[PDB]
Write an enzyme that holds these catalytic residues in place. Structure first.
Site, PDB file in Angstrom:
ATOM      1  N   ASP A 121       0.825  -1.187   0.000  1.00  0.00           N
ATOM      2  CA  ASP A 121       0.000   0.000   0.000  1.00  0.00           C
ATOM      3  C   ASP A 121       0.869   1.250   0.000  1.00  0.00           C
ATOM      4  N   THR A 159      -6.744   3.848  -1.825  1.00  0.00           N
ATOM      5  CA  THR A 159      -6.637   2.399  -1.697  1.00  0.00           C
ATOM      6  C   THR A 159      -7.791   1.561  -2.212  1.00  0.00           C
ATOM      7  N   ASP A 261       2.413   2.857   3.188  1.00  0.00           N
ATOM      8  CA  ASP A 261       1.391   3.898   3.228  1.00  0.00           C
ATOM      9  C   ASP A 261       1.294   4.601   4.569  1.00  0.00           C
ATOM     10  N   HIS A 265       2.090   8.659   5.234  1.00  0.00           N
ATOM     11  CA  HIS A 265       1.179   9.660   5.788  1.00  0.00           C
ATOM     12  C   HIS A 265       1.805  10.393   6.964  1.00  0.00           C
ATOM     13  N   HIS A 309      -0.951   2.868  -5.191  1.00  0.00           N
ATOM     14  CA  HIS A 309      -0.792   4.288  -5.498  1.00  0.00           C
ATOM     15  C   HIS A 309       0.459   4.780  -4.807  1.00  0.00           C
ATOM     16  N   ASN A 683     -24.156  11.281 -22.337  1.00  0.00           N
ATOM     17  CA  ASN A 683     -24.426  10.557 -21.110  1.00  0.00           C
ATOM     18  C   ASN A 683     -23.145  10.175 -20.362  1.00  0.00           C
ATOM     19  N   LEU A 687     -18.452   6.163 -23.934  1.00  0.00           N
ATOM     20  CA  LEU A 687     -18.747   5.351 -25.116  1.00  0.00           C
ATOM     21  C   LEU A 687     -19.518   6.147 -26.165  1.00  0.00           C
TER      22      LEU A 687
HETATM   23  C1  LIG Z   1     -15.211  -0.766 -18.910  1.00  0.00           C
HETATM   24  O1  LIG Z   1     -15.552  -2.134 -19.079  1.00  0.00           O
HETATM   25  C2  LIG Z   1     -16.856  -2.421 -18.618  1.00  0.00           C
HETATM   26  C3  LIG Z   1     -17.052  -3.938 -18.600  1.00  0.00           C
HETATM   27  O2  LIG Z   1     -17.105  -4.444 -19.920  1.00  0.00           O
HETATM   28  C4  LIG Z   1     -17.927  -1.688 -19.428  1.00  0.00           C
HETATM   29  O3  LIG Z   1     -19.107  -1.704 -18.655  1.00  0.00           O
HETATM   30  C5  LIG Z   1     -20.194  -2.374 -19.300  1.00  0.00           C
HETATM   31  O4  LIG Z   1     -20.821  -1.548 -20.245  1.00  0.00           O
HETATM   32  C6  LIG Z   1     -21.914  -2.172 -20.902  1.00  0.00           C
HETATM   33  C7  LIG Z   1     -22.471  -1.197 -21.939  1.00  0.00           C
HETATM   34  O5  LIG Z   1     -23.198  -0.168 -21.302  1.00  0.00           O
HETATM   35  C8  LIG Z   1     -22.991  -2.634 -19.919  1.00  0.00           C
HETATM   36  O6  LIG Z   1     -23.901  -3.450 -20.628  1.00  0.00           O
HETATM   37  C9  LIG Z   1     -25.252  -3.288 -20.152  1.00  0.00           C
HETATM   38  O7  LIG Z   1     -25.597  -4.287 -19.221  1.00  0.00           O
HETATM   39  C10 LIG Z   1     -26.863  -4.041 -18.651  1.00  0.00           C
HETATM   40  C11 LIG Z   1     -27.052  -4.979 -17.464  1.00  0.00           C
HETATM   41  O8  LIG Z   1     -25.849  -5.021 -16.718  1.00  0.00           O
HETATM   42  C12 LIG Z   1     -26.035  -5.794 -15.515  1.00  0.00           C
HETATM   43  O9  LIG Z   1     -25.473  -7.089 -15.634  1.00  0.00           O
HETATM   44  C13 LIG Z   1     -24.065  -7.088 -15.852  1.00  0.00           C
HETATM   45  C14 LIG Z   1     -23.527  -8.510 -16.027  1.00  0.00           C
HETATM   46  O10 LIG Z   1     -23.581  -9.229 -14.809  1.00  0.00           O
HETATM   47  C15 LIG Z   1     -23.336  -6.411 -14.691  1.00  0.00           C
HETATM   48  O11 LIG Z   1     -21.949  -6.358 -14.963  1.00  0.00           O
HETATM   49  C16 LIG Z   1     -23.883  -5.010 -14.463  1.00  0.00           C
HETATM   50  O12 LIG Z   1     -23.269  -4.471 -13.304  1.00  0.00           O
HETATM   51  C17 LIG Z   1     -23.494  -3.049 -13.255  1.00  0.00           C
HETATM   52  O13 LIG Z   1     -24.605  -2.714 -12.448  1.00  0.00           O
HETATM   53  C18 LIG Z   1     -24.509  -3.246 -11.142  1.00  0.00           C
HETATM   54  C19 LIG Z   1     -25.793  -2.963 -10.355  1.00  0.00           C
HETATM   55  O14 LIG Z   1     -26.279  -1.661 -10.622  1.00  0.00           O
HETATM   56  C20 LIG Z   1     -23.282  -2.686 -10.419  1.00  0.00           C
HETATM   57  O15 LIG Z   1     -23.096  -3.398  -9.212  1.00  0.00           O
HETATM   58  C21 LIG Z   1     -22.015  -2.790 -11.265  1.00  0.00           C
HETATM   59  O16 LIG Z   1     -21.023  -1.984 -10.658  1.00  0.00           O
HETATM   60  C22 LIG Z   1     -22.266  -2.325 -12.699  1.00  0.00           C
HETATM   61  O17 LIG Z   1     -22.513  -0.931 -12.725  1.00  0.00           O
HETATM   62  C23 LIG Z   1     -21.819  -0.265 -13.796  1.00  0.00           C
HETATM   63  O18 LIG Z   1     -22.473  -0.365 -15.047  1.00  0.00           O
HETATM   64  C24 LIG Z   1     -23.777   0.184 -15.050  1.00  0.00           C
HETATM   65  C25 LIG Z   1     -24.420  -0.042 -16.414  1.00  0.00           C
HETATM   66  O19 LIG Z   1     -24.872  -1.380 -16.453  1.00  0.00           O
HETATM   67  C26 LIG Z   1     -23.746   1.665 -14.685  1.00  0.00           C
HETATM   68  O20 LIG Z   1     -25.067   2.165 -14.643  1.00  0.00           O
HETATM   69  C27 LIG Z   1     -23.054   1.838 -13.331  1.00  0.00           C
HETATM   70  O21 LIG Z   1     -22.920   3.206 -13.013  1.00  0.00           O
HETATM   71  C28 LIG Z   1     -21.675   1.207 -13.420  1.00  0.00           C
HETATM   72  O22 LIG Z   1     -20.950   1.910 -14.399  1.00  0.00           O
HETATM   73  C29 LIG Z   1     -25.407  -5.080 -14.316  1.00  0.00           C
HETATM   74  O23 LIG Z   1     -25.733  -5.771 -13.124  1.00  0.00           O
HETATM   75  C30 LIG Z   1     -27.935  -4.215 -19.728  1.00  0.00           C
HETATM   76  O24 LIG Z   1     -29.217  -3.946 -19.202  1.00  0.00           O
HETATM   77  C31 LIG Z   1     -27.660  -3.259 -20.883  1.00  0.00           C
HETATM   78  O25 LIG Z   1     -28.544  -3.522 -21.957  1.00  0.00           O
HETATM   79  C32 LIG Z   1     -26.209  -3.392 -21.340  1.00  0.00           C
HETATM   80  O26 LIG Z   1     -26.029  -4.650 -21.958  1.00  0.00           O
HETATM   81  C33 LIG Z   1     -22.401  -3.437 -18.761  1.00  0.00           C
HETATM   82  O27 LIG Z   1     -23.323  -3.620 -17.700  1.00  0.00           O
HETATM   83  C34 LIG Z   1     -21.160  -2.762 -18.188  1.00  0.00           C
HETATM   84  N1  LIG Z   1     -20.489  -3.667 -17.266  1.00  0.00           N
HETATM   85  C35 LIG Z   1     -19.953  -3.261 -16.105  1.00  0.00           C
HETATM   86  C36 LIG Z   1     -19.405  -4.330 -15.202  1.00  0.00           C
HETATM   87  O28 LIG Z   1     -19.883  -2.079 -15.764  1.00  0.00           O
HETATM   88  C37 LIG Z   1     -17.550  -0.232 -19.661  1.00  0.00           C
HETATM   89  O29 LIG Z   1     -18.310   0.291 -20.722  1.00  0.00           O
HETATM   90  C38 LIG Z   1     -16.059  -0.032 -19.960  1.00  0.00           C
HETATM   91  N2  LIG Z   1     -15.739   1.387 -20.047  1.00  0.00           N
HETATM   92  C39 LIG Z   1     -15.182   1.961 -21.126  1.00  0.00           C
HETATM   93  C40 LIG Z   1     -15.032   3.466 -21.099  1.00  0.00           C
HETATM   94  O30 LIG Z   1     -14.817   1.343 -22.132  1.00  0.00           O
HETATM   95  C1  LIG Z   2      -8.288  -0.112   5.106  1.00  0.00           C
HETATM   96  N1  LIG Z   2      -7.912  -1.345   4.526  1.00  0.00           N
HETATM   97  C2  LIG Z   2      -7.399  -2.389   5.365  1.00  0.00           C
HETATM   98  C3  LIG Z   2      -7.491  -3.729   4.720  1.00  0.00           C
HETATM   99  N2  LIG Z   2      -7.303  -3.756   3.297  1.00  0.00           N
HETATM  100  C4  LIG Z   2      -6.859  -4.996   2.724  1.00  0.00           C
HETATM  101  N3  LIG Z   2      -6.419  -6.063   3.460  1.00  0.00           N
HETATM  102  C5  LIG Z   2      -6.006  -7.158   2.730  1.00  0.00           C
HETATM  103  O1  LIG Z   2      -5.527  -8.320   3.321  1.00  0.00           O
HETATM  104  C6  LIG Z   2      -6.095  -7.024   1.291  1.00  0.00           C
HETATM  105  C7  LIG Z   2      -5.677  -8.154   0.322  1.00  0.00           C
HETATM  106  C8  LIG Z   2      -5.758  -7.901  -1.205  1.00  0.00           C
HETATM  107  C9  LIG Z   2      -4.656  -8.236  -1.960  1.00  0.00           C
HETATM  108  C10 LIG Z   2      -4.685  -8.064  -3.291  1.00  0.00           C
HETATM  109  C11 LIG Z   2      -5.857  -7.551  -3.927  1.00  0.00           C
HETATM  110 CL1  LIG Z   2      -5.804  -7.369  -5.616  1.00  0.00          CL
HETATM  111  C12 LIG Z   2      -6.996  -7.222  -3.158  1.00  0.00           C
HETATM  112 CL2  LIG Z   2      -8.448  -6.596  -3.872  1.00  0.00          CL
HETATM  113  C13 LIG Z   2      -6.966  -7.394  -1.835  1.00  0.00           C
HETATM  114  S1  LIG Z   2      -6.716  -5.458   1.052  1.00  0.00           S
HETATM  115  C14 LIG Z   2      -7.517  -2.582   2.514  1.00  0.00           C
HETATM  116  C15 LIG Z   2      -7.236  -1.331   3.264  1.00  0.00           C
HETATM  117 CA   LIG Z   3     -22.043   7.815 -24.491  1.00  0.00          CA
HETATM  118 ZN   LIG Z   4      -3.419   2.699  -0.252  1.00  0.00          ZN
HETATM  119 ZN   LIG Z   5      -2.952   6.249   2.375  1.00  0.00          ZN
END
Ligand SMILES: *[C@@H]1O[C@H](CO)[C@@H](O[C@@H]2O[C@H](CO)[C@@H](O[C@@H]3O[C@H](CO[C@H]4O[C@H](CO)[C@@H](O)[C@H](O[C@H]5O[C@H](CO)[C@@H](O)[C@H](O)[C@@H]5O[C@H]5O[C@H](CO)[C@@H](O)[C@H](O)[C@@H]5O)[C@@H]4O)[C@@H](O)[C@H](O)[C@@H]3O)[C@H](O)[C@H]2NC(C)=O)[C@H](O)[C@H]1NC(C)=O
Ligand SMILES: CN1CCN(C2=NC(=O)/C(=C/c3ccc(Cl)c(Cl)c3)S2)CC1
Ligand SMILES: [Ca+2]
Ligand SMILES: [Zn+2]
Ligand SMILES: [Zn+2]
Ligand SMILES: *[C@@H]1O[C@H](CO)[C@@H](O[C@@H]2O[C@H](CO)[C@@H](O)[C@H](O)[C@H]2NC(C)=O)[C@H](O)[C@H]1NC(C)=O
Ligand SMILES: *[C@@H]1O[C@H](CO)[C@@H](O[C@@H]2O[C@H](CO)[C@@H](O)[C@H](O)[C@H]2NC(C)=O)[C@H](O)[C@H]1NC(C)=O
Ligand SMILES: [K+]
Ligand code: NA
Length: 801
Positions: A121, A159, A261, A265, A309, A683, A687
């Protein structure tokens, strides 16, 4: 409820998925307060420290000891890591000469090289310079394996967002961990570093490595460790897991250290107190390597040494207070420090006035140490907007500074001299990457890269198919000896048309006027045919269009373009400027000249009337008239199909770019190839917008208004070769400039453009890959380079640090 009266006998740090009411004994049980009553006495043994001594060699096995020096400990898998050195005349791993590991040398029963991820970290990349004087084990990994000079974290450079980005390959806006602290307005709940809420799975999106592994039948060690478990015990546990029977042993392991880390700090990054924690980390790495050597695994395992970081000098004395700018700060909640996120204290408070707040925060002190942004206006490279947990109002804070709500929030005596969180292109925020082992290269330096790329590589190292993520698979193939991913070019979806002359000037009623005419190109029979245009101005092949649309290739002496019949402007415009090229003016009589394009239907053309009507919107050109090859050719630049809508504010930037900067780049880089174009992202999801998503048009017309304009500037990496005659690797820099109706972002914009425009462009530097996401185009398809090398090129970010 958990029945604590159970026992951890024969269960210490089990990989068993054990759920309530059952008693737990895993490395996370303390964090859930669900450990068996005897977990601490059976599993967290500390007796006699962590190192064998001469007097312990061949001892009788006492199960009370933290680790063992008994004759049987080796096959039992629980020797102290220095056992063989102290008791069997072996050398520490670090004292052994570096030797290339060309294939894995694993014990029988090992089907693949295990992967161990050693995360530290707050390990600033520049700490590596302290070298073997301070960190001999880490220095051996770095010099003998594969290293980058640094690795770029995600923003914010804290982190939680970065660790989860490492685990998922996703931007925080996608995985959802957008800060160490956050408020979700739909949950109406707050996530904090400390506390229980973060344990709820509803916060965590995407698919982290351990899940990807498990779903594909690869066993993961438990990545997380309860903070109370000392590092020596984490190491001993990893080593024990590696000694497990073939049918239980995991393939992937994670170690985590909270240092350096914490000390950063306290003491700041350049504090002399930093040596001690760096030494301690190195000692842990040494315990791991010594341990692996004892298990005959030191030429079998792949080790990744990686940070989340860096760390900057930040003290109490450098705090900006919003109460200096705003009248009633008690009515807002501020996520503070090295970044700012603002929302009303009472969620959805109707009196919350964001425009007035931003107004009071905009260029109000000459030495102002933060800048306010609506999130859609943040540099696109940050990818920090498309999530409900990211407040609309953001403050990008200057390196070395803090922002706080009011002076009551700072307590001078202060106790800290370091912090992090700033813009991820800031040098002090960069972190470390080293890969060591059979699958990594030997004694190889690689260029810096982004942490979003690592998930794909860890999947490659483990034989896994990555879940969809933001890395570009193949862009890091150059880190690996084998297990590379063979990428495949995406398929062009829309083929272009090559329109000839099919209309007359008389066919056009667009309201455009040109005071002069070139009657000579009207005698040009080969006017706007291919000729040598493509080989002069389109050096790497045409961009492929990866969506369904309709567009035309248009040729000119000075440039080529891919004109969209749907969006009424080019998707891209490509041209080459030699080192010796000349800048010229736009003649007085041509100031307001716009010429219709006989190649393209009046129905698929913009009209100048809309621009005469819209009192706020003006227009610009993608190929600059300033860089015409001849007074004759300059007439091509004034075509309606080279025209794009620009606010006069933006034109201040674009004209200076076109007239001064492009030639400056050509001069310095021995010629440049430029591809420029529009981007639509209303939006703010990073994309390409579909038509339904575009929200602004030129007044009384259907000419869509771009949210940004990009430029991709390419030359020969070997600057001794002109850009148009380059034999080898390329050099690239790009930008995605925000298309805004004012220059409020640039505090010095009242001055001459030479005093502020370049500063703006630097902030909005971009990867070619970013532009591809935003445009649905695919660049560099025709080159003399490997596709894997081109992927690397497209992920490059020119940071200007
Ligand atoms: C970085 O790479 C990622 C991964 O490929 C891209 O993100 C994807 O973009 C596409 C296109 O918009 C989205 O497709 C849509 O999917 C929805 C349904 O999606 C649901 O199911 C999928 C699969 O399990 C899941 O991954 C999704 O998870 C999102 O929502 C969750 C609950 O709200 C949340 O926990 C999770 O963090 C994630 O949120 C993120 O994406 C949503 C948009 O879905 C967004 O609103 C939120 O703010 C976050 O950004 C979800 O349960 C369909 O209904 C649509 O029709 C469409 O197919 C993918 O969902 C999305 N995947 C992820 C994981 O984000 C990025 O585009 C890419 N970025 C760049 C710049 O290239
Ligand atoms: C405030 N905080 C304390 C614990 N913490 C973590 N404790 C662990 O043992 C972690 C293991 C870990 C090691 C590698 C990856 Cl990629 C991830 Cl996501 C998690 S991360 C994050 C910072
Ligand atoms: Ca767009
Ligand atoms: Zn850190
Ligand atoms: Zn720190
Ligand atoms: C909680 O855990 C304790 C220890 O495992 C359980 O105590 C056992 O209960 C069984 C059945 O009642 C007895 O036969 C054993 O003698 C007990 N074992 C020991 C070591 O004392 C207890 O049952 C559990 N409580 C529950 C199930 O709610
Ligand atoms: C923006 O800053 C101005 C000051 O520059 C604030 O104006 C003050 O506001 C109160 C009530 O509006 C007046 O009584 C004072 O006379 C003003 N001060 C001065 C010196 O002009 C304004 O409140 C700020 N806006 C926000 C939203 O914080
Ligand atoms: K106008
Ligand atoms: Na300004």
């Amino acid at each position: 409820w958990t029945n604590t009266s159970g026992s951890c006998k024969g269960r210490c740090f089990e990989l068993q998925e054990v759920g309530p009411p059952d008693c737990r004994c895993d490395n996370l049980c303390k964090s859930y307060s669900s450990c068996c009553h005897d977990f601490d006495e059976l599993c967290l043994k500390t007796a006699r420290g962590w190192e064998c001594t001469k007097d312990r060699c061949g001892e009788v096995r006492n199960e009370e000891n933290a680790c063992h020096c008994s004759e049987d400990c080796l096959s039992r898998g629980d020797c102290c890591t220095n056992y063989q050195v102290v008791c069997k005349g072996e050398s520490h791993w670090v004292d052994d000469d570096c030797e290339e590991i060309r294939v894995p040398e694993c014990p029988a029963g090992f089907v693949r090289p295990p992967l161990i991820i050693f995360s530290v970290d707050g390990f600033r990349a520049s700490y590596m310079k302290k070298g073997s004087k301070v960190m001999p084990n880490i220095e051996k990994l770095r010099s003998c394996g594969t290293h980058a000079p640094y690795m770029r974290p995600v923003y914010p450079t804290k982190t939680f967002p970065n660790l989860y980005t490492l685990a998922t390959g996703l931007y925080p806006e996608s995985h959802g961990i957008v800060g160490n602290s956050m408020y979700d307005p739909v949950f109406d709940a707050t996530f904090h570093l400390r506390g229980r809420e973060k344990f709820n799975h509803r916060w965590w999106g995407g698919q982290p490595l351990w899940i990807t592994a498990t779903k594909q039948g690869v066993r993961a060690g438990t990545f997380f460790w309860s903070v109370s478990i000392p590092h020596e015990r984490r190491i001993l546990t990893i080593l024990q897991w590696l000694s497990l029977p073939d049918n239980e042993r995991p393939s992937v392991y994670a170690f985590y250290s909270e240092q350096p880390d914490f000390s950063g700090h306290k003491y700041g990054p350049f504090g002399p107190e930093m040596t001690n924690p760096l030494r301690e980390i190195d000692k842990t790495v040494g315990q791991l390597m010594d341990g692996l050597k004892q298990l005959k695994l030191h030429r079998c395992v792949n080790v990744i040494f990686v940070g989340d970081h860096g760390m900057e000098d930040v003290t109490c004395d450098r705090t900006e207070f919003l109460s200096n700018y705003l009248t009633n700060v008690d009515d807002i909640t501020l996520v503070p420090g090295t970044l700012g996120r603002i929302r009303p204290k009472i969620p959805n408070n109707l009196k919350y006035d964001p425009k007035a707040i931003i107004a009071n925060l905009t260029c109000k002190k000459p030495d102002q140490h933060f800048k306010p942004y609506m999130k859609q206006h943040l540099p696109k490279r940050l990818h920090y907007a498309n999530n409900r947990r990211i407040e609309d109002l953001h403050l990008l804070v200057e390196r070395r500074w803090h922002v706080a709500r009011k002076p009551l929030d700072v307590y001078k005596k202060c106790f800290f001299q370091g912090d992090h969180g700033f813009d991820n292109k800031v040098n002090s925020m960069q972190t470390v990457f080293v890969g060591y082992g059979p699958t990594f290269k030997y004694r190889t330096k690689v260029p810096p890269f982004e942490n979003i790329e690592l998930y794909n590589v860890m999947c490659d190292l483990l034989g896994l198919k990555p879940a969809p993520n933001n890395g570009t698979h193949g862009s890091l193939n150059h880190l690996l000896r084998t297990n590379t991913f063979r990428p495949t070019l995406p398929e062009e979806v829309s083929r272009p048309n090559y329109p000839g002359i099919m209309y007359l000037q008389s066919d056009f009623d667009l309201g455009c006027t040109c005071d002069d005419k070139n009657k000579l190109e009207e005698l040009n029979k080969r006017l706007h045919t291919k000729g040598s245009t493509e080989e002069r101005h389109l050096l790497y092949g045409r961009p492929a269009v990866l969506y369904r649309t309709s567009y035309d290739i248009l040729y000119h002496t000075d440039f080529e373009s891919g004109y969209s019949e749907i969006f009424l402007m080019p998707l891209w415009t490509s041209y080459t400027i030699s080192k010796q090229a000349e800048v010229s003016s736009i003649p007085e009589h041509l100031t307001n000249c716009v010429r219709p394009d006989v190649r393209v239907s009046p129905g698929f053309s913009q009209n100048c009337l809309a621009y005469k009507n819209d009192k706020q919107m003006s227009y610009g050109f993608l190929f600059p008239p300033y860089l015409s090859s001849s007074p004759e050719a300059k007439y091509d630049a004034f075509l309606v199909t080279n025209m794009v809508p620009m606010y006069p504010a933006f034109k201040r930037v674009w004209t200076y770019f076109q007239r001064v900067l492009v030639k400056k780049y050509a001069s310095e880089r021995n010629g440049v190839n430029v591809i420029s174009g529009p981007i639509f992202d209303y939006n703010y999801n990073g994309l390409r917008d579909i038509e339904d998503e575009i929200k602004q048009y030129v007044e009384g017309s259907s000419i869509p208004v771009p949210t940004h304009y990009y430029s991709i500037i390419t030359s020969c990496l070997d600057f001794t070769q002109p850009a148009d005659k380059c034999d080898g690797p390329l050099s690239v820099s790009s930008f995605i400039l925000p298309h805004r109706p004012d220059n409020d972002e640039s505090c010095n914009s009242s001055e001459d453009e030479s005093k502020w425009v370049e500063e703006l462009m630097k902030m909005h530097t971009a990867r070619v890959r970013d532009i591809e996401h935003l445009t649905g185009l695919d660049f560099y398809r025709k080159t003399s380079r490997s596709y894997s090398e081109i992927l690397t090129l497209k992920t490059y970010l020119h940071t200007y640090e």
